[PDB]
Amino acid sequence: TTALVCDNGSGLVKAGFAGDDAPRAVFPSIVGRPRHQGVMVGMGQKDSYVGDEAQSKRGILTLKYPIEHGIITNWDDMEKIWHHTFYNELRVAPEEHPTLLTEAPLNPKANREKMTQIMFETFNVPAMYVAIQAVLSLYASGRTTGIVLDSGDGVTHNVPIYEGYALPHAIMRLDLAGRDLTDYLMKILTERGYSFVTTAEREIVRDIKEKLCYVALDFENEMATAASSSSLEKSYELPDGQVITIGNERFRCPETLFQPSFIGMESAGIHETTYNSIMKCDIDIRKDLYANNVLSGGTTMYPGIADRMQKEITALAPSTMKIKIIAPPERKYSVWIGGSILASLSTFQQMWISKQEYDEAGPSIVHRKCF
Amino acid sequence: TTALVCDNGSGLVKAGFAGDDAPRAVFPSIVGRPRHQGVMVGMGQKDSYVGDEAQSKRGILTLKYPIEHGIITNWDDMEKIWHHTFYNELRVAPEEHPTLLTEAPLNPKANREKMTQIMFETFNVPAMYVAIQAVLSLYASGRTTGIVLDSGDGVTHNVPIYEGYALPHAIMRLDLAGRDLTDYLMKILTERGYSFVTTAEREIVRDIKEKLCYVALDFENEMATAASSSSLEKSYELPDGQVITIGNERFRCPETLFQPSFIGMESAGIHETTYNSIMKCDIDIRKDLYANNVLSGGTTMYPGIADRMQKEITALAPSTMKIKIIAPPERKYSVWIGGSILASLSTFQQMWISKQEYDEAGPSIVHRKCF
């Protein structure tokens, strides 16, 4: 039979059968209970709208993501999300399909063990396998080397790989991602008068960020230009009218990636954690990693980031090496495409964690040889 | 049929059919298992890369030479190296070709006996013969007398020969060679800030030594000059950028040959063990040995050694004798060229150790008349 390539993510759940080009169903991972009282009788009001249904009734819900930073903080809601994904968005019972979840690097063990225990006890799948979210993104590019920066919505991690041999001592995981950029944008919009507070209006700020923000090639020059002319002010129409005008908030929101001091984080930007991740590698594979830097994940879709990052790394790196940044147009679904490719391989067909194996060793089987 | 003139050496395996000018395939003798984990499936990752393949993937391997000082310390790896040499670099099955290995003087017997046992049982050659590495280097020079200093990469030995009669009581074998010079260079580079530790970076230090180091004609004057001017500082680009500048480390690394007290060895340099080897000979053949001093082996390729050695010996020797140092441009492959010449001789064709002879007397046949 065919395998189910699910990809929990944090912000958008992407799923679909193995062997295709794009995920079959992509929908936000939010579960929102209603918060008001409700007076109409017999309206058929449910107790929790999940997935894309709660992005249409969000006016009277309190949306809450079940995955904070890669890790899962609310297991009941995550189980509800998985149940919805299997039964309503794909309509395939899990009793007859292997599953291939994905997990960020350096995550707590208990999260992974609970994930496999749920998949084997509640949904009762035949066999499931958990894979690191960066190796798949490297599969999708058709490479076999390269250092991949997978800046998702929950957590940004940077896994270097050479000739198929991952370097476990050079993984640099940073917890700045799309959600913190949404919060920072929502916080700097208040400097013009627009106040978004409700958890429903966070979605509106996210839409503003997606449609308007861009990464500046040079920060100081853009700050000077936006403060003199008015060629940058782009307007946007809220879900009820009252258009708003975003000035130099456009390139200040995604600039947080390269200067995490804006949101008070100490660490260095995504332009310098990649160079540090390279320098921890051996001295003889640094040229190949320099030449095959891969971008993935949703948050790396800002217009103009593949040039800013290249300029920064070229500034840091030695002058002789060639710096090349692979930015495929299908960046958002790169991890899932790689997952489909991996699940479609014949050599991989014996790596699944078969159910009888789980019955013999318990949920701690995932840390064992079947990784 | 044609004979296979293999030459194990220590650092570079040189092989080729008898009767040519240069070895057909020359490649480092290193076998490196991968050391990291490896996440890509189906990449076709082998368990041990040998020869020149492991000098390209050395970034994720742990290279380890199977021959320490002439002697062989790891027989399985040496068997792997031989198998590679026969089947992939020459592509001739050994069942139809005599072999002519080479061995340093004064080596343990068990090494030679195990070598012949392997060649007769595993590879199943028709007949093999083991020859001393210095007599061949004397063949290649077209001489018949002379004292040859064969400073390889494993061990430096100094065999005097007159009129074809070797003098077994005058062989002076010293264990300082190219590998110790590489280690000493890697140890003195730390005085400027460059630290090379990994077994892969030993190859980089070896490349630095080959391309930059030279032997000073007079040591104290060079030490004084390099400490005042800056006309010696030559720069070199690492495999990733970050050029380095070598100062008076240039002529201090190969100076260890003439002053083995630098690496803590007690014995006298290669300039004085040759004179001692001569003085042990009879009083009537010392003039001929003085006039026909032969250099061979890789490590004698330093620019300016054929003058320093001549100056030193002229200082030691009596003033009347003429001191001449033969330094052919084809020094590195001198032993193998001599091996080809010896294997191509008709008079030598009945000295091979035929397989039936080995079957009758066991591996101890090599010490017998068939030397």
């Binding site: 999708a140 590019s141 058709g142 050599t347 064992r368 | 490896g38 499936v41 189906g42």
Partner: peptide, 16 residues
Amino acid sequence: VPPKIPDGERVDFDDI
């Protein structure tokens, strides 16, 4: 015990 990937053969840079 880390997951040791079993013995495969290919492929790369073609399905892409």
